[PDB]
Amino acid sequence: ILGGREAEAHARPYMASVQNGAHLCGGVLVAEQWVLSAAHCLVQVLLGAHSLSQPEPSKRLYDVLRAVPHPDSQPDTIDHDLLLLQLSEKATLGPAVRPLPWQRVDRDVAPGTLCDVAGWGIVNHAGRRPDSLQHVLLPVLDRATCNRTERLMCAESNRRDSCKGDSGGPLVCGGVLEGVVTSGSRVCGNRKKPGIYTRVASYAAWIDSVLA
Template identity: 60%
Template sequence: MAVVLLCSQGPGQWPGSSSSSSSMMAGPSLARLVAAVLLGAALCAAQPGVGTLDVREAQPHARPYMASVQVNGTHRCGGALLSAKWVLSAAHCLDGGAPELPQVLLGAHSLSEPEPSTRLYDVSRAVRHPYSLPDSLEHDLILLQLAEEAALGRAVRPLPWQQEDRELPPGTRCDVAGWTVGTPIGRRPDLLEALLPVLVRSGCNLRALNDERGLVGVTERQICTDLRRRDRCRGRALGDSGSPLVCGGVLEGVVTSRGHLCGDPSGPGISTRVSSYAPWIRSVLEDGAGN
């Protein structure tokens, strides 16, 4: 399932160009071609670590922090268990007028096969970030308080989250997992995983983004990762929004744009940078500690 990215062609060759065709150009046309090649070289040089992107089935229960956020018994989004009573996900996962609070499935690898480790928990409270909006990917976080403490064990365990407000260096390899619908694997919805490189934010903002909510740039409170794949998913990619972006065993981001596990050659993947919201997350968790 590997895919060769644009930059793998080398900074000196623009896709579709050749030395014979460029030698026929002169004057302004040649100048424009040179400028385009130089821009492409700069973008590739500024994005270390970009190479191939593979999606595969995760080892069962190797990510005991994974949560399936469900509405009316159907998987809606991923999430990360922060403590025995709190799950962090993306606020837009509950847009669309869901009449009731969601439920959270913990301890799962498969969403279609019964497993003794799984348990479905009711949610007693959903706390959206106060500045999150349905038509925006900014501040796209929601905290879900479970009605009772989760039974922790080998298949259910909280994930440490980044509380120091810091940027991830470009080229950092992070992983994401989720139960994406319409996967290239084409099997039952078991947990999938992918390794993603962090990209330079300025480079991401120069690439066209293909999101129905009209995202026009990546902010300082977001993380940009590369998604380009040749083997696209069948149909629309759903289900991995809200999933944790994990770097070095620590939660660094929450997936906010669709298609992290399917790939989108027209634009990068966007995750909300958790550390930039650390004060808000801590305040909500502390406020609910006695409930």
């Protein structure tokens, strides 16, 4: 996260780090035993975390039973850029580890709405990797502006942006997951090149079918 700020410890209890003991991607706890992430983020899952490195009462590492990338995703695209990870056991839920409701209604976020993106991605254009979770509020772009599919959304990127290592993490509007950070390489922080997020509402059938 560029142009952001440190998150409050455990205030975003759905937030996962997909990890060789190293953070690779964000993810969102969406059920007791399932984390939603991005397709190219492919393995363990750290729940309950603020610091990656420091001991915390709520921190717990989970092995993954299986990884279910969207069947239509491809290594060279950011279409269908979703991944569902099943933990090897149901997560211990509490204040600090809690699923986030995700958008099932297929309607766009009002353009202009500030939504919240969190991650342990890089915090500058040198390689700088933060120990503690970062976040930033970002206005959602209208689809025409974003275009210049039905299944992607855009947010402004005027220095404040998602970037490398934020892939698979959340874009939250009004307490509901609306987007998942994309897992393709892109220039960050350039206003002319918006951040790109998978519109979770477009994938409602798919997510349900996996979790069914």
